[PDB]
Amino acid sequence: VIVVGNGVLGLSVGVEIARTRPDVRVTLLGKPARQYGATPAAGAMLGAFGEVTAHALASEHGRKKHALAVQAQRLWPEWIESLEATGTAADGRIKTADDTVVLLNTVGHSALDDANFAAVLTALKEANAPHEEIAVESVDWIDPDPNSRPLRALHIEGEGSVDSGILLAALERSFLQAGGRLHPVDATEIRASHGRVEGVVTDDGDFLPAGHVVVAAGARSQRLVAALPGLAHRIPRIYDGVGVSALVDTWDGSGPATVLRTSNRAFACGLHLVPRAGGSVYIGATNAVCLEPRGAASIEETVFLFNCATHQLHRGLNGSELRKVQVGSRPAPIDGFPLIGGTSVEGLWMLSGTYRDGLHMSPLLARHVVSLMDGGTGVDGLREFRPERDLISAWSREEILDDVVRHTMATGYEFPWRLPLEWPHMMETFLQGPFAELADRLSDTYTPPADLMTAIMFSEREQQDELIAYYADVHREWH
Amino acid sequence: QTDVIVVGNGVLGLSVGVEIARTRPDVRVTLLGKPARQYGATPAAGAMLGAFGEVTAHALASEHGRKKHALAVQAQRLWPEWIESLEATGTAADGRIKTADDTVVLLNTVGHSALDDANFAAVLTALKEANAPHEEIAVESVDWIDPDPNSRPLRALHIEGEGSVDSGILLAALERSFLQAGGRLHPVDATEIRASHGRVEGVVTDDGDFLPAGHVVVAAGARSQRLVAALPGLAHRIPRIYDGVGVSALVDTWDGSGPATVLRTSNRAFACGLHLVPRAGGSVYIGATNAVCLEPRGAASIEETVFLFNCATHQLHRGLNGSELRKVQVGSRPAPIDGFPLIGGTSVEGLWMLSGTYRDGLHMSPLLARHVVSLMDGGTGVDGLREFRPERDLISAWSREEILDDVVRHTMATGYEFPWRLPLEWPHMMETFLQGPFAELADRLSDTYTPPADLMTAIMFSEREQQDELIAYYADVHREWH
Amino acid sequence: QTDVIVVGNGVLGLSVGVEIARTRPDVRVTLLGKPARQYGATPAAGAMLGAFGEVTAHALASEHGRKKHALAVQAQRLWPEWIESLEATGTAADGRIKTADDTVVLLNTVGHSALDDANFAAVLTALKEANAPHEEIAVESVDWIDPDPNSRPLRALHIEGEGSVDSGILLAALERSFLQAGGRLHPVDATEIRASHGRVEGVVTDDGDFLPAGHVVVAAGARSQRLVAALPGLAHRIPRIYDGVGVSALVDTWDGSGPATVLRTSNRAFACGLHLVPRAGGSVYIGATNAVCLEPRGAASIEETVFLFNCATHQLHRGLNGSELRKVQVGSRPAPIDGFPLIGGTSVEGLWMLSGTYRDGLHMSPLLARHVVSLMDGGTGVDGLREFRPERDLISAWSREEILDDVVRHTMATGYEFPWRLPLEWPHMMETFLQGPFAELADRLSDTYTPPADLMTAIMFSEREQQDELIAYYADVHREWH
Amino acid sequence: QTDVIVVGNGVLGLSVGVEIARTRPDVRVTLLGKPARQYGATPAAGAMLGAFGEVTAHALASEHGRKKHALAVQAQRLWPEWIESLEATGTAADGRIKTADDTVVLLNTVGHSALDDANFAAVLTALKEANAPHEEIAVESVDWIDPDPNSRPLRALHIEGEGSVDSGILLAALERSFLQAGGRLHPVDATEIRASHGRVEGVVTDDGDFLPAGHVVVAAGARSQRLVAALPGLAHRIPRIYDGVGVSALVDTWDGSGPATVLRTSNRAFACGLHLVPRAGGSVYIGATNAVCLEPRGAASIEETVFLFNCATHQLHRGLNGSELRKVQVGSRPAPIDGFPLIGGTSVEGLWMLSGTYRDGLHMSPLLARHVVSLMDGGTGVDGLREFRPERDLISAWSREEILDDVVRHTMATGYEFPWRLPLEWPHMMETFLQGPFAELADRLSDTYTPPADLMTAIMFSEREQQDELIAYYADVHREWH
Ligand SMILES: Cc1cc2nc3c(=O)[nH]c(=O)nc-3n(C[C@H](O)[C@H](O)[C@H](O)COP(=O)(O)OP(=O)(O)OC[C@H]3O[C@@H](n4cnc5c(N)ncnc54)[C@H](O)[C@@H]3O)c2cc1C
Ligand SMILES: Cc1cc2nc3c(=O)[nH]c(=O)nc-3n(C[C@H](O)[C@H](O)[C@H](O)COP(=O)(O)OP(=O)(O)OC[C@H]3O[C@@H](n4cnc5c(N)ncnc54)[C@H](O)[C@@H]3O)c2cc1C
């Protein structure tokens, strides 16, 4: 078995394969630099209920994704125990918090933040999850700007966070302990013929043979498989959801006892603080879907993240020392849903397109793919997210056009801007036409989700034309 | 018969006038004051029948504040039958006194957490303690409002049976009801109260005339103490009343709509606040600023107009931005120097006062009127109003420490309510550097008396000569009573 | 008759009234209009004798704009003797028409570089071209001003002999001078101009009366075209005039001080602008907003009041913030649909128009009055005003492309003048998304006519029915003239 | 020995190293310091060859400030031939030390008028006094810039022959030139200077070794006084040097473009400033914050990063907003406690110092190097450096009153540079309430010494124990020198 990719998904599937099939040789590809790596740029939150939006839970596909997140949360305590078991005290602790506080402030669009707060409360009650709405005065540690302060707060019990760096180290160590081998090169090409995988050409010119190849190369995953015959229009594209986060040494070495977060905001950015050991906090995280990868933060991303954290969470962060600006690529599927499971090529598997919550879902996703590889049926709810598929249409064009204008306006309210009171209504009216024109031009059948539609709107004419051709080639393949 | 003169033609003068005229067929009652109602609080009022909406943590932390609150809750019970009795003297064409039955209190972040969050909690507690009908409601369920999202409320409280009146229709109904009961309106001002052998003789008017009386009731708003202070000893025995200058506006809404309820915040920096009071005929009332001034002012500052308009358009309804301004209104809330009203009798036989009611004299008017009329008839009026007798040593309802904490918090709230945008370290620095100057002023003014925050800020920014005159006043009061 | 009726009692009606009365003592001249001056531009004006201060790059880029500018410079020469002749009919106690001799133009960054920087350069160029006395001065040398440092000017231009008048004292002096010259004031409105056999017979008034005349001069401000449009054919032969609704204010300064000069910016988004005009007696005039409205409006919006006050307090003097608001004033600048005035004769014998002067009819008034009186006497009046004859095809002074560039720039300027605070990518995005809708509207309205930016924005945000009626109007004009 | 040890591998150490090596080929010169250059000012510098751009009204108001300015002007004359001599030891492929020949100073309103307007005037005066080539230019003529219109400059000044260097390429050229002249690089730190019988013996290094020398030149940046203060008496005879922590950034521009000139403002609140220094290969340098810290700091605060980025994106080029952040750089400007450099000889024979150069040691480096080498050869070096001898009583370059005016003005400037948005009365209130606490601190610290504003603000917000330690330090210095 060859696992292509050394993020949370590759290493998690690597560990599960190595541990459950001691009869098989498992090799994991990827380099210590983890170029464009989502996992090392993550806090990370074990986000299930915190990831709930009204828009997600309005669609059948969104409700399915949410069910999987709730299932994954149950696996984390024993998964962490099993990974820490391979180490010693000096390796540090994977878990950094047990609980999450969701804050509601007015530094955002009512149409996102108010709707999403209501949706989180409903989803918690529906799941019989332990939680309570608490007085904001009872939230320890926070020191917001009064004009940026929360007026409601929600305590979620047993929804916590991990140190993504300590998790990656624990996964690598656990992989080696179970007889896995780490080969620090990248796959250049998957070799297959007579409808079956033969192995992987690496970027040092070598060839590694295999009966099974599992592609978990984050935002590079579809580009790798798309080289095989037909698969260019049978595996949904995955783009770079470029995310900026930061490590901050707090002014007094303090940190909150819980995750602090807002609900998901304009184009799947959001504000959160994840506790870390040793007088550090993680703050995150911006999001921008990019049609080509980017490995450096924009000035705008850094200013936005810092401004939100200092005003809405703790003014003490303003005088705190910046240790690191981190950048990683959320694997952003073109149809808005993950690519998990088997392929029309025997022995070829994919684990990708997980966007904001692959790290959280990792133990569940790993166990699902390993079950499938062993001739099992894995987890009942994952079939719709099979990687070889027509593009999913989870929303009407009308729903998406309402969403993209609302998210565009939310980039103003989240800044937060100060404008003449008539300007927002004028901007809303003048945004509708151009987005409706773009959606109608791209395809008669497919509509990109808002996060991708905004990226396409502001891309070059040539990039838009190439996407029109892609959508036409997909329609031809499947209809 | 034995003549009564009421000095003042606001809500308190006219309300006592109506009650005397109706209950005392033995008395001829003459009410003084001009149609212009110079510096008049009542015509500038929305007005809210504010009892629970007027609750602050700071008010209910003092015994005097809790006593004042009990009286406001009692007054609310009198309004339905009072309005019936006033409308009875008119016809349909005179219009309706009541403009709303219910109030929604909104909590947004365009203000200081130390005022708005504390006060929202205090209002909820006071409602529950009183067993008053109310509920916390979803903000999405508040009809009509269309705030700027960055200025929007995240909590809302529905108060059942706490409503509003049209202050103009109330004044017209009071005047008409006064005349119907045999009262006479004499449109001149009192210049001087005449007394000798410890009894009132009557009033010199500003047309040079003298009107004799056995009883003089002073309800001249912010002018009330200045009028009586001319009589022997009374300069240091009747607490001073200053002008709580308030700006409000009448707006013709873009579509002729209005909310079904009062919309308000809790009381904000130095007893300003944001509210919308429904009116008939496609008008809304928006209010209201507050600034304690050591001398009267009858025109709005540019700052007051911009602040009121900016708050209403952002926090209540952006539609008000394109709405037509009909009138900017200015009136003087009678602001007592010791923070409590001046209600009842005097050391001068036949001399009575009804004043120093600040934000809620109009709401309390039927109760206050019935109290003073009962006292004039040899009754005991309303239990609990004895503490607010007009001839008194200055009340000390708070420690100097409580007031110094309050004045710094209210100063900072003028920033958060703007709302300002500043470097994140600036507020803490300003807070630290405000404490010393206010502590120095409080210590300099008097060893015994501390002005409430609303007055202390006015004194801080007044001329050296005005501060020195107040030091002398406080010293003369201490000498009189100790 | 040989009787003359002037319809309208603003600066243009009264100025032409005075000139007719003085030069034809043999004829009866009657001037119509009421003391209320409903929607009156003149009483809402400061007013600046604005010639060089009114220069914009956009105006001087067109032949028609350069012609209008030449006339403004000519008008300035008439003011000293005009004022002498008007004050001559009064006494010392009537007060002085002139309130300042000089103007300082300030350049700050509370606005669009594409308007304010371009316009500052255009004013400097026009002054140098005219050999007019002026100096660029250090901002530190501008007396009186006390701006917010973040709103302060960094350049200042002293214009010698470009001053201001008190519009109220001017109107009083014109009425008095009209009577002195044998004019009669009849305080009613014209309802109808009566004509037949291609000649005026007189005016029906709103009291039901009929006044006969050989000459009718229409100077009814924004009502002028609506009045004449009732006569056969004239609906599509006299360019429409709309209401350029303008808000200004009178402020009593905190210390009774004022600047010795006019203080102004260049003309800003959609022909608004910021200025302070000195007044006597501790008052200043601040102005002035502009919004072209397809129907008249006589009350300020909240938005207009907040914008004017915010600009004046930040950019001119923070002392205005604590100053007392005396009056909010609203008047209608007569806004011609083709961007140029309507001055002179008609196809109806004895029917004359003096209107559509927008921002600078008051400044041009002595020149315009003398021009129309010369024409009435069979003269040729002033060279260069023939192009602005009232009975005309709509002028096309700019390409559709120039106007579309202008309307997007002016739209963006409403943001920068606020001033807004936005993410740095938002303005470019808004600019890109504004171009298409304005291009679509311009193409839809007419194949030949394009409204100037100030009108195009009003049409963009008007009702579908109002847009359709304008499409029909433009089509009927094209049919009449082509 | 006749051996020379240079302690420090910044611009000053390497520059003096090169000059010694080149002029004394007979002697062994060893330079200490590690490639990491911990807290190093030089590698965090753009850097501007700032002479006229560094002019402030406040600097040129003092005799010591005028002396410092004269030296900066003298240094600028040396740069062309100094660069020629350093590039001569390399080839084209080493890159070019010079990145721009000219500087444009921009004046915008994102700052305090009391700093930015005064400083712009002071720069213009200093250029004219020096007969320096310069022109005030139209802002529209400044190439490349694309500011937010609300943040845009309205004046611009072109300074000819005041340019910038790549600090990294300069350090590489200095190291290469040092080796070419026979210098030896020993990559360890000095721990201790050894001296007895009033003469240097050499240096103990942090690897435990001892290097003998007849001459030790201390150029260890902000660590320089701490190193020499260990010798007898010198703790209170060598003025303390603190860390002027400065944050800068390298940005890859969206299109690989950059300006042809340095772009800068004048020096702003507490010796921060905004500038962009061109670099090769599609990079720009932006700088630079300043904070005097009583202990060294090697990481940027969030506040420093946000402020730098916000100023550059608004005031210089909005294109930087979408540009990629390559590196946040932090270095320590050596901040002398008395505000002036420590340059020259000591009471210890063979012991020299080159430090406390704050914002402009890099610029002054060729002049400072030549000065110390002249002194070591028994010369008098450069006229006017005598006041800045390292062994001295603390300089008192300003009255306590001047410094107290300055510290309040600089405090207020941190608001205007943000830029904040606050109620118009708040700034005057803050100014009044800042004066007392700073006056109290100045009076408490010492009866004779007053820290300059940049240090006084750091002391104001430091711990009580840190303030008390400074009171003791000042008392020990007074005792030593009086
Ligand atoms: C700023 C940020 C914040 C986040 N916060 C959270 C959070 O709070 N909670 C959460 O659950 N998740 C979070 N995530 C992550 C999210 O869950 C992702 O979907 C998840 O990390 C995806 O993991 P992955 O292993 O699929 O991809 P990655 O983590 O990107 O791993 C892919 C790896 O494969 C390597 N690779 C690429 N090409 C090749 C090749 N040809 N051969 C070999 N190796 C290759 C890459 O270099 C990389 O190291 C966050 C991500 C970002 C960017
Ligand atoms: C902006 C604003 C908003 C308000 N909103 C509310 C509200 O929502 N709810 C509420 O309950 N109350 C409100 N109030 C009013 C508050 O309750 C006042 O305390 C109350 O109106 C005081 O009434 P009064 O009759 O004592 O005084 P006033 O209403 O001031 O009446 C005094 C009258 O006496 C006249 N007078 C003065 N001197 C003489 C003289 N020498 N001789 C004769 N006549 C004289 C004055 O001209 C005046 O007309 C508001 C007031 C203001 C200013």
Author numbering:
A (entry chain D): 13 to 491
B (entry chain A), C (entry chain B), D (entry chain C): 10 to 491
Excerpt from the paper describing this PDB structure:
Each single structure orchestrates two apparent binding cavities one for FAD and the other one for glycine. The crystals treated with glycine or sarcosine showed an extra electron density where the α-C atom of glycine or sarcosine is best described as a sp3 configuration. The glycine is anchored in place by: (a) Nη2 and Nε of R342 that H-bond with the terminal carboxylate of glycine (2.8 and 2.9 Å) and π-stack with the guanidine group of R368; (b) the α-C atom of glycine is at a H-bonding distance to the N5 atom of the isoalloxazine ring (3.0 Å); (c) the amine group of glycine forms a H-bond with the carbonyl group of R368 (2.9 Å). H284 and Y294 are associated with each other via H-bonding (4.1 Å) in close proximity to the amino group (4.9 Å) of glycine, presumably serving as a catalytic dyad to deprotonate α-amine of glycine in support of the hydride transfer mechanism, as the activity of site-directed mutants H284A and Y294F was compromised to some extent. This electron density appears to exhibit two different lobes a short one and an extended one (at the “H subunit” of the structure).
Here, we report a noncanonical FAD-dependent enzyme Orf1 that adds a glycine-derived N-formimidoyl group to glycinothricin to form the antibiotic BD-12. One site could accommodate glycine and the other glycinothricin or glycylthricin. The resultant product is no longer sensitive to aminoglycoside-modifying enzymes, a strategy that antibiotic-producing species employ to counter drug resistance in competing species.
